[PDB]
Amino acid sequence: NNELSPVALRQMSCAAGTTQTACTDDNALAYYNTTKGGRFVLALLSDLQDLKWARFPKSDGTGTIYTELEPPCRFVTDTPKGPKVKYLYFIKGLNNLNRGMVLGSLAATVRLQ
Amino acid sequence: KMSDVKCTSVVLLSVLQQLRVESSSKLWAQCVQLHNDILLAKDTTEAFEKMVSLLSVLLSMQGAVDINKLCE
Amino acid sequence: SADAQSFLNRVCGVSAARLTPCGTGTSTDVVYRAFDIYNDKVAGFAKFLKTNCCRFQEKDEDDNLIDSYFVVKRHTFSNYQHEETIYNLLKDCPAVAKHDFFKFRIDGDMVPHISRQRLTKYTMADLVYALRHFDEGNCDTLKEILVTYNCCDDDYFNKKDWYDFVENPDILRVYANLGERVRQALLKTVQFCDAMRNAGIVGVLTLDNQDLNGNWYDFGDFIQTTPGSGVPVVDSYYSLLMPILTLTRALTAESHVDTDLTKPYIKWDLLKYDFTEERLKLFDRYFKYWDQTYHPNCVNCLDDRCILHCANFNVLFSTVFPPTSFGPLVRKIFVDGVPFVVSTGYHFRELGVVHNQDVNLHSSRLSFKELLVYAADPAMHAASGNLLLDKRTTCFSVAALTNNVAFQTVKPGNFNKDFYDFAVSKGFFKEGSSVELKHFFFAQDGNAAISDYDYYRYNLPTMCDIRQLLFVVEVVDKYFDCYDGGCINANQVIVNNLDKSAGFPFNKWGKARLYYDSMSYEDQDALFAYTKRNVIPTITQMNLKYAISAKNRARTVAGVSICSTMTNRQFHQKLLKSIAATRGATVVIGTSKFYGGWHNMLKTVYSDVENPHLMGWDYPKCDRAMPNMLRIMASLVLARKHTTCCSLSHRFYRLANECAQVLSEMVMCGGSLYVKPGGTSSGDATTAYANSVFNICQAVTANVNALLSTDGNKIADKYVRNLQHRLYECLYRNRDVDTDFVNEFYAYLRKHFSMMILSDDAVVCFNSTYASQGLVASIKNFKSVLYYQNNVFMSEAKCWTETDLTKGPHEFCSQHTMLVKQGDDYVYLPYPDPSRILGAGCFVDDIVKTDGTLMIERFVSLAIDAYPLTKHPNQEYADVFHLYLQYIRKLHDELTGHMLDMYSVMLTNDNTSRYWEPEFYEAMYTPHT
Amino acid sequence: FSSLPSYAAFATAQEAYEQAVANGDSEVVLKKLKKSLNVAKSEFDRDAAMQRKLEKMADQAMTQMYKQARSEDKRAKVTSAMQTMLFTMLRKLDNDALNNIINNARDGCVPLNIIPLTTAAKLMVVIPDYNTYKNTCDGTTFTYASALWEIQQVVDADSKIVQLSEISMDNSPNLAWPLIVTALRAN
């Protein structure tokens, strides 16, 4: 009886772009866990495949932090009956346990087919 | 008489070492073995037999000690 | 036998094997089964009695039983379908045991059944638990594992000490017969992880779900995701298994061509020293899905927590490469147009390749500092020396610097007959007397210097559990946060004795005083700044001692060079001077036993522990058998005080220097250069303090092992049951440091486990009710930890326990304790062994000391040490002090008699009358000063 | 600075006192003589101490100067000794095989542990028993480290020459082990 972690991931909206010149227009969602320190983003879900950088509004005076993203995967979601051919980027340097948490929670919430 | 032998062994090995017995590896090894076994002994007969052996080592060397004068 | 036969037939299935009717509704219930559990309620790695698992053994042709079992279990419909679904994706993998799903009728209901086929009796969690929680009197599982796989015969366990690494060194061979059976498991687990990733499955791998053939069979806690993106979580699988990979020498097949144990060894180029590619291949071959990044060379690591991680893997992988490729890296320079050979690097077995940053070719002239550095290192000493092949020892013999071998001998020791006669006339040394003579000067022959050096065969490469070590390191730095440290200049260094030897070759021209006054404060600063970006190897000289003791074995000491000491003092002395100036701390170095110091230390240890008991232990072969991962760790916590004065590169190069000239180095034993496998040197500037760190680390590890191996469902206290579920997370499920729990586990360990540490001596006051329930460490937990983490067996005859606190510790620093009334209040006083004091009086190490009149200060100190014996209930002990006082009086009278005839001087001023009165010695144990 | 003024002041004091003995009358003059004597003595006392202090300081400074000059004369000795040792050790090297092994290296760095193995011209073997002598150095020629060595000399723990014919199973108990055998590389 050794089971994946029980943490629950909270959803938030953010913007990301192909290059470091991130287009700060909401085009992505982020999954984060707020228990430790402040907020920590575990993964990003979007519709475009060209994303390679994502800029997060830092909780500090005039601070803008850009986090690099790994190559996307592909997922198919059904909130309504629709295509929802979305892509999941994992923040670079994310251990296996956090990936398991994100994937389990996402699979449970949206079937992912 | 256990302490007396355990001290006489120390004095005897000091006397042997002053007579330059260290120059023979075999004989010095035997002398050290005999000396270190009397000090750890708990019985008296064993200590006296090993004392006999060590004193025989000393008496083998003829001109080293003038036994007649020392025994006065 | 109607339904039973049908059930057996169905269990057999189409495989057509012959199954013994060993199973029923129940089966072999349990012998003992080790499980790694983690829920939202409980968590740990513990040994239980799992009741129900229908196990049928298979008999080979000729009606002979083999190690193959069919395990049938009853499953609810919901889990049956889930395991059937997840099994149909992984079925096409060689590393998955075959499963059979079938529904059978019991009492009118169709109950499902899952049957795993051809599983060994034990699992890989039983081997790890057996070797990590070792009890000498309970070895049934380990014995049966060793016998079943032809490691040894069952008559091998009738030997005296078949489990001791010191008494029976052949056991290291027996364990080595499990190496291939573990390497094959390491390969099959990588196969399984590849299958999981390809099929799109997420789950946690555990040790208890793999048998000893390497097959995986429990998919109840797995989930399913998109194919092509799976995630095997291997953090508690590899970490719990790491100490076993080095004990069974799993990676020995890598030394043979084509990784075949039947083919000859690999022939490596003799000039090769850079094995970065091989290390990367090994890591990618055996630890493919380990997440954290691995740096073959620790020069590129990011902090001290990243140096231990990679040094562990380097320790594992350095056993595959030839021994001649480790050591100083030599290069040819030109000075005055003349060629020298100098060291310009180092290939550490545990830190990789390091290259000096300041290599200057074509020099013109050498100053004092450069001459010192060039004469210190062993390059030109070994290059210009005869090849050596010493068959007396198994160590690596580098070279012979002379044409003759030197055989050093120790001498008997002088006899003080006057004191012996006086004591005998006073009634000592009679038959049946409690106090006798037990300390003597033992003599040694010429083969003593090398036979004592050959005890480094007890230092074996010990890979550690990294995820556990990275937490104990954090909990061990909270004991040293009340001090201050940093670098100091050459004008702030204090040297006690300047008439001491300066090592080799510097002992050929003067003492340590010649080099401290011949170098300016600007030269010493230049050398210290040089060592921060370069590696300087040195030579340590082994010498024999001439001192009283109670054992035959010769005692040797290691004198290190002058460069090492010079540069280490400026690095550590500021911190070392503060550890010895603090009162009331765990480490009691620098605290005296006089003027009520013993009482203060004991009362501090007792603290507010509830239901207290006292315990103490000892380390066999402490300096010889210390692994190289705990010495680096000890040196890494002492260097955490340098956050402001040094950068990361400077700290790494200081660590490299320490390792190169203390840990693994060249020793000059008898005029010949040998290589030192490891351990601790008895001349390093930080020996006592590093030993204290090692002691604290072992104690904390024992506590962590004690708390995590408890049931968890049987802990009554709510606070101590949430502290076990959170310790497992901080060890095996948190990657960063949880600063708020190392403060919570540190406090729990102070209210229930109070320590007093001095180098390798320790005294513990612990809660007796917790230890019985398995919430704090006992003497069995230490014996377990020292076995797999120290390659040493600690017998429960050199350890002590005390259930009454009014009698104090049984021993601490060779001193006993005694509660005595003093000035209307009771206090604890230390007293020695009377045999020690009498032997010091009777036997001396210099012919001049046998003249009493010349040495009256010699007996005042002995009387100071022997005073507390006056208050012992035994009356044969109390007489030693009075004997010493009377002998002092007699010596004074003789001295006054002699100096009146040879000269005509009647000593006018005499205050010696106070040295033969008890009022002078009693003030040494009164708390006024 | 102090001697002559003090002597003159005390001489004047004594001369003034002599008047009191000569006549004794006019006791007020006696009081003046006493006061002048006391003041002169006080001045001499004032002058007498700074001279001693300065002399002691000068002596200490001179001793310090002497000490500094004798701690820079032993520095030269040790420097010369170290230079001589390094140059002699260099002379003991073999510059033909060492150059070969160095030039066969990738970038010039080679491990230290192979230089004695591949460039040394002599071998020393220390043998504790006869079973080890039979398995390693048997005969007048043997092999080690991929080279052929010819036995040059054999001595015992007493530095006594032992002939190769005395080393036998029957004669082994009469030998003083260990035996040190020195051999010479064959070309």
Place this chain on the structure above:
Amino acid sequence: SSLPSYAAFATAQEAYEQAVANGDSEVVLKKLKKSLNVAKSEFDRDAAMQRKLEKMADQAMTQMYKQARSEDKRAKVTSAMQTMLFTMLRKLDNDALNNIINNARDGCVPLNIIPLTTAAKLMVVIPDYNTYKNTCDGTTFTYASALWEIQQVVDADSKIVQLSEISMDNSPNLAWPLIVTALRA
């Protein structure tokens, strides 16, 4: 005391005693006290200079004593150890040690270490018939409070003398320094 200043002070002190009589010697007590204190100051100045000399002399004498005794101890090291050894052996008064000591005093010293085993080789040197007659009877040999069985006897010049030949009649027929080999019984 016994110093020229002391007496002076004493005299002044004596005058102060007279202060009791004659009403303080006609009230000259203040001048008397002043003079007394001045003389006492001079005496105190004198005393310390002798105290310092005494300390220096005592230290020098102690150092000389130390050096002489150390040299004496380190000079008679070989002569003073053998006497101690033989005094202790005499005090032990054991049967075995006394036997071998007496025999060695006569001249019958061993040639190796007396082996302490049931079957071992012991070689001894008999210098004269008398010692042979006393120790050697028949085929047995009494030595170190033990019985040894003779296996061979070799004359001063290598030969094999038979036990029959050794007799008073043939006493001058052999070079008498005689090596006797025996095995422990």
Place this chain on the structure above:
RNA sequence: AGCAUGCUACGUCAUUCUCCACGCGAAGCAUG
């Protein structure tokens, strides 16, 4: 009576000895 000088007594600064608290050398003993 007031002011100044001389003699005799009491409180503030420099030297001579006597006891306590801190640094540098030499010897010795114990512990890990």
Place this chain on the structure above:
RNA sequence: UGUCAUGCUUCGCGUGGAGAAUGACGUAGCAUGCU
């Protein structure tokens, strides 16, 4: 040949405080001189 730290005892030289003695400057009481 004779290592690293900690503690304690004894002796010898240097710095800071307290007691006694000797040197001049100021204030209080009494007496004498000029006025």
Place this chain on the structure above:
RNA sequence: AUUAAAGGUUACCUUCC
């Protein structure tokens, strides 16, 4: 760990959370 663990009548309930 078996239907994580223990208990009452593997269904339900109780107990740890």
